[PDB]
Write a protein that holds these residues in place. Structure first.
Motif: not given
Ligand SMILES: [Mg+2]
Lengths: 7, 93
Positions: B31-37
């Motif tokens: 995905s182009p979207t950022l998913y931070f922990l």
């Protein structure tokens, strides 16, 4: 938080 | 049983890596979207603020926007991103 907010 | 690579929902098995650009744990994704922990998840996954990747299970996600240029995620001011809480697949920590 001052860094980010919930959208 | 299989690793999610986009459209993350709670219950998903995900691959989490220590990203070099952001110096932060992020979910591997196409995905182009950022998913931070989420920072609160580090002890559940046996990580510290240095393991290079881990498998996790999504418990929660929260859509956020940076309000400061200089922030813990090293994203530009105004960047939007998800913050993801995760746990190990089968160990209670
Ligand atoms: Mg955090």
């Amino acid at each position: 938080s001052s860094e980010f907010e919930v959208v | 049983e299989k690793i999610a690579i986009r459209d993350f929902q709670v219950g998903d098995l995900v691959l989490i890596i220590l990203d070099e650009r952001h110096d932060n744990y992020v979910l591997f994704t196409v995905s182009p979207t950022l998913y931070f922990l989420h920072s609160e998840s580090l002890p559940a996954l046996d990580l510290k603020p240095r393991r290079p990747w881990v498998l996790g299970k999504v418990m929660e996600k929260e859509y956020c926007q940076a309000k400061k240029a200089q922030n813990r995620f090293k994203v530009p001011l105004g960047t939007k991103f998800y913050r993801v809480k995760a746990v190990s697949w089968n160990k209670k920590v």
